[model samples]
Target chain A: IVTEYQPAWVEQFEEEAQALKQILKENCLKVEHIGSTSVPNLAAKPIIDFLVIVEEIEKVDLLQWEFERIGYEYMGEFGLSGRRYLRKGPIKRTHHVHIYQFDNTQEILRHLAFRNYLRENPAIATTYGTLKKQLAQAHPDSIDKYMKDAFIKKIEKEALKKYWE
Target chain B: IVTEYQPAWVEQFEEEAQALKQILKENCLKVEHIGSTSVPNLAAKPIIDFLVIVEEIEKVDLLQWEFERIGYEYMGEFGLSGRRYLRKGPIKRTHHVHIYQFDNTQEILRHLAFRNYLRENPAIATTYGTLKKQLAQAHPDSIDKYMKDAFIKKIEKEALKKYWE
Candidate 1:
C-alpha cells in the first residue's frame, strides 16, 4: 500500500528509473514515468509506474538477477503479453517497472498517449482525479473495472471513432 | 469512501436477502450473509454482502424487472461464471449480492473458509484489520515498504552487484 501522491513523486520516481536505466543501459532505449500520479497533481495509488522501452526485450531476462538484487521482484510479463513487470515490494506495492521492447507500439503509444492526453486535457484530468479519489476511498476494487475499463476506454474509443469516421 | 461495520448491518442485510430469497424461491437454494460486516465485531465497509446459491443461473434474467422493482439490479456474471451479482443503494452503497450455483464449489467453499479462517486465526485477523484500517486513512501512504524501496535504490545500488555476483 502506497500513498496517493507527494510533491517528491517525480524526483523519487526518476531516481528509481535512473537506477533501472543504468543496469539496463546496454539495451535500454527509453524510460518515462506514466500513469495518474505522473500527471501534475492527479491523485493516485502511489505506484511509481514506469514505461521502459528496451532495444531488445531479451536483455530484460539477463537483468532479472541484477534487478532482484536491487529489491525488484522480476515478474516476467506479469499480465501484459509483451512486457516485463517488476514490483518493488510485494506487500506494500509501491513501485512498478514496466519494460517493453522499443517496437511494442501498442503499449508505448497507448501509455504515452494516455499520459500526454491527460496532461493536455485538464478537464479530463480533473474528472479522472476526482474519480480516482473516490476510488481510493473504495479499494479491493479493480482498476480495470472502474475508471479505466469504463471512462477512459469510452474516451479512447470515441476519440478514435471521431478521427476514423 | 469507507464501509464501516455498522450494528444495523446484520438486520439490513437480512431484509434484502429475504426479499431476494422470496423472489427466487426454490431457484434460490440458500442465502447467507457474508463479508467482514457479517462477522460479528469485524471491521468492514458498512456495505452488507450476501451470497445466494441458486439452482440455475439461466433463470436469472427472468427476474430483472422484479428484482429492479425491489431496488436490486442484476449485474450479469460480472466476469464470474454461473453467478449474478447485485447491489443496492448505488449512492450510499448499502448491500451487495453475490449469487452463485451450488455447483460453483470453488467460490462458495472458499468464501465460507475465508470467513471461518479469521475466527480460527486471531493473529491473522488482527493483522488484516490493522492493514485495512490503515488503507482507509493513509490511502496506502504509511506502508513500511516505500521508505525501504527508496533506501535500497538510493543507498544500495552498488550492493546490487555484490548480491548477484
Candidate 2:
C-alpha cells in the first residue's frame, strides 16, 4: 500500500523483474506485474509490485541467496504471511515482490481479476482513487490506517465474496 | 553419454529452448544447454538436450497443457522417472526437457561440471568423442548400447568421482 510513483520507476522495476525472472528460472510458475502500477493510467504510487508464483514455498531458501545477489533484499514474510516480500536496487525501490506457491492460484488469480476489473471499469477506478486520496490525507502518517480506512469492510467484503467465490 | 555433433542439431535445440522459455515463464528454474551437444567441439548427434529445473514435479501438469498448446508432444515420464520429456516442431526434435526438484542442485551441477571439464580439456574431449564415435558405429540403433559403451566402468568411475566430489 506504499504510494510513491516516479517516471523511471516502471522501467527500473521491469529491469529488476527480468533479472529476477532469470535467477529464479524454473522455480517460478508465473512472474506477473500486479498491484496498482500494473494497471495503466491509474494514479498509483510509483512502487512496482510483482507476484511470482512457484510450486512450493519450502524451497524458497535455495533461491534467497540468488535473489539477494541480484540486489533484492529479502524482507522475510510480509504481514500477509502467505507471501514472501523483497526489495531491490537504488532509490530504495519501495517495491514489493510477492512470492506465492503455485498451488495458491486462487488468491493470485483474484488479485489479477480485481486489477483487471478496476482497469476495465474506470468508474470503479476513479471511486477507489478518490477514496484512497481521502484516506491518505486523513491518515497522513499512518499507511496502515490509510489502507484500512480506504478498503475496510465495504470493498473487502465485495472483493472477497466476488473473487473468492 | 549421447553421441556426434550434427551442427544443425544445436541450433534446432536452442530454438526449442527459447520457445519453451517464453511460454513457461517462471515455472522453469534453470534451462541449461546440457548433455552431449553442450560439450563444445565434441561430435554429438545433432540433438540438443536441455535440463529444466523446476520447483516440484507434480506442479508440472500446468505446463503439460501449454506444451501441447505449442505443439510439443508430452511423452509422459520417459522412463527417467523424475524428468518430463517433450518433442516439438517438424523434425521431431529429440530435445529432452529434464524437470527436477528445485533444491536438487547436485544432478544439474554434475552434468554441467562434466561437460565443462570436457570443454576445458580437449584431450579428454577427444578421448570421449572417439569413444562415442566407436560406440555409435557399433550400436548403430541401440541407445542402451550407446550409453553403456560410451561410459565404460573405468572412465565413468574416474569422471563421476572427480566431478561429484
Candidate 3:
C-alpha cells in the first residue's frame, strides 16, 4: 500500500515556499503549493510540489542560482517541455518545484483544473485517493507509474472538460 | 468608497479565463482566476483580474492574435515595467489579464498574500470593507479617490508587513 502522507509534509511545503518566496522575491511571478501534497487529507507521495510561474525561461537562471544557494539543487526540466524542475534539501526532505512561463497552455490549465476538480468533487477525490493507495502498494518506488496510474487519461480528460466549461 | 463588487464579477472572471485559456492553450504556461474576485465574499473592484504566465514575451503576438480572434482586444501593457496587460470584452464586461514572463517578478505573490491575509483575518478584512463604504460615500464619483482614500498608507504598510512575513 502507498504510505500515508505525513502531516509534516504540509509544514515542510510551507516552509520551503516561504524560503523560496523570500529568495526569489521580485523574480517569482506566482508560487503555489500545488499537486497532491497541497490537498489536505489526500494521500500523496511524500514529496512536496510547488508550482512557480515566472515571466520568462531566460530569467530562470537567476532563480536557479538563488534556489541552489539556498540548498535546493536544480533537477533539470519536466513535463510540458522545458518547464524547469528542482528539488530542495535532501532526498528525504523530498520537495519538488515545477517552474513554468506564463501564457495559456493546456498543461497549465490541466494542472489548475485537476486541483480545482479535486477541490470541488470530494467523492471523485476520495476515490482517486483510494486508487493512489492501491497503486502505492503495487509500485512502491515507481513515481512515474504512481502519477500515471493515479491520474488516468480518462480522469484528466473529464477534469479538463469540467474546468474549461 | 469602492463600490460593492458585484457577484457577477466572479462569473465574468471565469468566462475571461476560459476564453483566454481556449485561445492560448499551448502557449499558456499557467492561467489563474486570481485576485479578489477569485475569493468568496471578498469585496473588490468591479473589474475581474486574471494572472497569466507565459514562456516568452517575444511569443506574446501569437497569444495576442488568438485573444483578438476570440474577441479580446489587447490593451496596452500596464503595471510595472515588466508586466504585460490585456483586456477582453466591452467596458461592462471588462476582464483584465495580467501577463508575466515565467519568473519575471514577485508581484503575483504580493497579490495572493493580500487576498490570503484578508481571508484569514476577517476582522481586518471587515475593517477594510468598512473603510471602502466610508470612502465610497465621500467620493461618490471618483473611483480612484475612493480606492486611494480607503487604502491609506497605514493599511497598506500593515498589510505589506504581514504579507512579507
Candidate 4:
C-alpha cells in the first residue's frame, strides 16, 4: 500500500545499514539511503532502499551465504550489471539492498543525487508524492503494465538534472 | 561503420527534415536533429536522426502511406510508446525519424536538450567521441549485448543535466 511518508523510514534504514555495514566490513566503501523512503514527506510504499558501494562487485558475490544468514535473499546482479541485489522481508519486502562496485560512479551518483535533490526540493517532492498517491488510488488496482514506468521516466531526468546542476 | 563527425550530417538532416515537414505539413510542430550526428565533432554512424513533434501522434499514424511514398519505412512506434518510428534507405539505413505528440514535453526536451548540450560542450562531446571510437575499434566487432547501451546511459544523464541546468 502507498502511504504517507514516515519519519521512522530513516531510522529503519540507519538500523539496517548498521547491520549491513558490519557484515560487509572492509568490502563496503560507502552506504547511501536511496529510493522514495529517503525523501522527506514523499508518500511511498514502505520500503527502505540501501545502496552499498563496495571495493569490488566480485567481493560481494562471495558473501551470499553471509547475507542469507541475516534474512536477506542474495540476488546476484538481479538483471542489473555490476551490482549485487539483496532483499529482506520476502513476504512484505521491507527493504532492498543494492551493492555496486565503487568504480560504478554513474549508478552510485544517480541514486544519491536524486535522493538528495528530493530532500532539498520539497515542492517537487510533494508533486511526486501526490502523483503516486493518486495513481495508486485511481487504479484501485493496475498497469498498462507501463503507466508507472512512464511516469517515473518523466520525473527521473528532471530529478537527476536538479541534482547535478 | 562508425565514422568521424561530418558537417554534411547537418545538411542531410536539414534536407530530409524539409521533406518530412512538408509531408507532415500542419501536423508538424517542431523538427530537430538528434543523435550523435547532431553534435559537431562527435563521431557517429553517419545516420541522420530527425525528431518531429506533431500536433498529435494519431495524425502521423494516418499518414503511413504518405511516409512510405516518400521512401520511408513507416514503423508504428517501433518499440517506443507514443512515437512513430520511420527510416529511409532500408538497406544502408541513411535516416531515422521519430514522431511524437507536441504535448510530450519530456521526450521532446530530452533529445533536443541533449543534442544542444553536446554541441555547446565540445570537451564532453570529444570525450564521448573518443569512447565510441575506442569501443568500436576495441570490438572491431561485439557486446555483452549491452556495452553500447551501458556507455550511452552513462553520458545521457550527464547531457540532460547540462541541458536543464
Best by DockQ: 3
What TM value does the first chain of each candidate achieve? 0.85, 0.78, 0.83, 0.91
Q: Residues B35-100, candidate 4, lDDT per residue (tens digit)?
A: 899988898888899888776689787789988998998889888889899988767889999887
Model 4 chain A worst lDDT run, 10 consecutive residues = A156-165
True contacts kept of each: 0.00, 0.00, 0.00, 0.00
DockQ of 3: 0.04
What local lDDT score does residue B139 receive in model 4, on the 0 to 100 scale?
Answer: 75
As a TM-score, model 4 comes out at 0.49
In candidate 3, what are the lDDT values of residues B31-135, reduced to their tens digit? 777666665666666667888876565577666676777766776466475577776666455577887665443554445556666767777777776776777
> Candidate 3 local accuracy as lDDT?
0.67
Highest TM-score: give the candidate number. 4
Off by over 4 Å in 2: A1-165, B1-10, B88-93, B149-165
Instruction: Report how far off residue B138 is in candidate 4 (Å).
Output: 32
- Model 3 misses residue B2 by how many Å? 28
**After best superposition, candidate 1 residue A17: deviation in angstroms?**
1.2
Q: How close is candidate 2 to the true structure, as a TM-score?
A: 0.44
The DockQ-derived docking category for candidate 2 is incorrect
lDDT of 4 by residue, A51-143 (tens): 997766797877889899999999898898898999987677899998887556457666776788788879878887888777877775564
- Report the lDDT of model 2 for residue B68: 85
